[PDB]
Design a protein around this nucleic acid. Sequence first.
RNA 1: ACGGAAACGCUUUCUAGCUCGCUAUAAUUACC
Lengths: 220, 220, 123, 124, 345
Amino acid sequence: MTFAKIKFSAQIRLETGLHIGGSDAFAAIGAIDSPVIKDPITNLPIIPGSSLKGKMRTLLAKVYNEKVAEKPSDDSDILSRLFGNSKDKRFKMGRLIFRDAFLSNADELDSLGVRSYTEVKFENTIDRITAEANPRQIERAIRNSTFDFELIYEITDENENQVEEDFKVIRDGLKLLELDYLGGSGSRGYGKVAFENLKATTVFGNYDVKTLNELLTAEV
Amino acid sequence: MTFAKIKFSAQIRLETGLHIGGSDAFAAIGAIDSPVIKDPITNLPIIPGSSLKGKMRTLLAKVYNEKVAEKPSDDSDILSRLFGNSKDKRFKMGRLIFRDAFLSNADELDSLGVRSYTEVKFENTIDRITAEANPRQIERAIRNSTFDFELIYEITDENENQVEEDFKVIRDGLKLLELDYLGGSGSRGYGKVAFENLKATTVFGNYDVKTLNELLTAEV
Amino acid sequence: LTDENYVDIAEKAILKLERNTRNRKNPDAFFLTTSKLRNLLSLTSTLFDESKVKEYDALLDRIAYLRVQFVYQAGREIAVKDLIEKAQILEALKEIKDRETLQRFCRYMEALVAYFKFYGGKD
Amino acid sequence: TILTDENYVDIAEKAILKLERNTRNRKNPDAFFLTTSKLRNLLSLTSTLFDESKVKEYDALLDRIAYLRVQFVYQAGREIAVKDLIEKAQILEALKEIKDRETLQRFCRYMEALVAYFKFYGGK
Amino acid sequence: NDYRTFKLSLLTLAPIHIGNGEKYTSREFIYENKKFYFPDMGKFYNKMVEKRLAEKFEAFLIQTRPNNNRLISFLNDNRIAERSFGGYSISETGLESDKNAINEVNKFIRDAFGNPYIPGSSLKGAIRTILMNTTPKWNNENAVNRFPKENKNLIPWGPKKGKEYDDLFNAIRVSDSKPFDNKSLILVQKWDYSAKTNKAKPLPLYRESISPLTKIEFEITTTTDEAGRLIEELGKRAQAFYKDYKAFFLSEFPDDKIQANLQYPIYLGAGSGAWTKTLFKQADGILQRRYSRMKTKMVKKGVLKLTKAPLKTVKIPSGNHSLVKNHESFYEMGKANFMIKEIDK
RNA sequence: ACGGAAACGCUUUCUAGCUCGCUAUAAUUACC
């Protein structure tokens, strides 16, 4: 199948508060919380593509390897094919490109009457012997935020069957992330997220996306 | 048929953080970072033309070769014509001159109140058995940065129809860069790039650009 | 008023700030805790962050809200009201005509907090 | 007075030597309380200042020298080994004494020197 | 289909108040008609700027050096007829009494948007003390090295170098609640029943809490077998923990006060007291020792915590199942019950 | 009627590939 690029686009909607990244650089003077990864220029939360790729890959290893997979070098050819493998000559360059996702709906939220685009959640832990409480604050990207999502798939030397299987793997990946969380304090209910208006477009070359679009909207 | 020089100009906007870099032992004494390539006098990020040319060329080989070329010497006459081929007498000198791109909007950013032109992105890796986390900092040129882009095309000894084909290849190249990344940690969301205000201008000789300007405002 | 040599002012205020001198180790012993400030600092920073892509004319609701929580919190805890006095913050707020003036005030808050933490404030 | 062209590096070295070390570590030698991670966001700002001292003129960067001072005290507030550093190395005084691009660039270099000799004599 | 998912429905049998850190002051609201008035201090300010009242409002608010009348009195002192700024007011139950009174109230935890919700973090806390108090493997230890504390290596949870990632509680994920309509909030008061006094003397503390007979839903996912077959028996284990906690504590207080148990019990978040938030077995001697010398933890065990709330008591199991037994309108604070399910795939 | 005329130290080459800033933690205990 002669070269082509299919662009998977969606909006990530945060169903619960999300917390990813950041450091004491991006920090506000007198912030006491664990801050979030932010776009430096707008100081808005951003969902780093590194995160999305990471989580989707490690979840997909549980499904698609049927192997121990001690290090990502050891993943199956089907995952290495998509996410890339540094130690295999064939897969040194991967067919997927994840993109930093940026907040769309700031205006929607400003309308809904938010006084910031990030919430700081107070939590604590209560000692079970002494009953003493130790509190903690942590920043989260606010609930019902949306982020414009882009993932790029490259058809080069993979003729007929392989593109189909790859599409299956991408849909399985996203669904698995929907049935999991985007890295945060996930066990305590963070990072639940949903892919809205998930849609395929051929942005280079010639390919038929009718079948895929059907399979995306319903089956993911 | 005659001689003329056309200047393709645009503004490259960084849609995400960009990382080229790689002088480690010539790095700032600062702290840990994988540094990015910088113009020595201003210490600002630079997009080296070598990078643009390289990436655009290897992208375009996937479209325009229609037989896989072991070496860049083995690229098609259409690519050799444009980017140069050291081992073909005809194409030893290529019709394209890429230029180091420099940060244009320093003033725009200083107005928006930015305190650095590069962010440090904090990432980690999770051991797939031990669940242990190994963290990693890596430098990017900040997201809404813009760079002056310049590419020079030389018409000598080409059928006006050959000039047409060349223009097709240039537009395909730029679009392919837009649907890919500028070399970085690309699979993890880096190096997304856009060409704004893209226009051709004949700066030497006489050539008619009006039709081309229309067509490349169409295809970006 | 305050501008462009305001760090020196911020400091000059903070060294004047109220002290719990009773404590056995009561050095300066500030009565104040970053905890008390937090909300209005998240507010001030969100104001700065916001004034970059919006216009001084159309923000002023949020500047009311800032003054409000200043006074409210000034009521709710004594050391806050004390701070707002000795650093003349409430005088400063009413004085904000330009986006230049506003950004200056945001910076001022930053400075106050920095020198608070420096001089043995407890966060 | 404090920072001279002949002066700075020898001072920086002396400061890194006089710095607070963890004597409570039986296992460790002279081992520093201070840690590059604490300085990172600070000396990033120093470097952006030096880098811009070439492309802009002194007055244009007053805002920057403001925000430097702030961050310094803030970090000295938040970390004990930081306060120790900027104490022993007279940092804040050294900022006060900067009227000049010559003086400014000298301070940036001063930080460079401090950090070099920090890492040299045991680091993060 | 590879995980397991459980859907847990929480019916509140009493006011539940987890809450954030903030608390409304007697100057920020107005008791006027059935409902309490909770404005947006912002919108107030900007209508009082539009009324040329602002400088008064400030000097009134900044006037707290322990202000002894500070209320919506200041309104009435001015013209104060306007009253359309701010949203969501709470209705006067008559309980939490003495009105005309309330000096201070504790806000319930509300999300970004101003709606309140039950953070899965807090529910997980309570699920934890249930799971902990049952399982015999963990019910025997604390650290003595040094006033005592929780062992905190009792359940391995971190990444260990060279070991196969054993962390059980990472494999139990507790959903954040949805936000719920702020119209179910109540303003329950704290009353402490001491069976030494054998009377119940009301304390000066008000908690905005969830009105009883509310349903609130949660989802809980497990990514490991042990966690699957742990949350499986959350029913058994819940009722077992209540067995021990009655036998230990409730069963030494007048049966009037003990609430009846309807589905499966949980103590969640409130001033429901120390034993709900501990391994009470092992906590006993130590916890007491914590309150020697001040306002004492006077009984050898605790006081029992009660609240005045409207007797809703409507639940129908072939008659009046009336929630609380007693007649002085006494629910047991932060008492709720639940039912857990299993979905599929 | 200068050991001197004439002669670009040039043509080709992405500082790239792989890596979730992650891991337990009810905003809570006490009321003579």
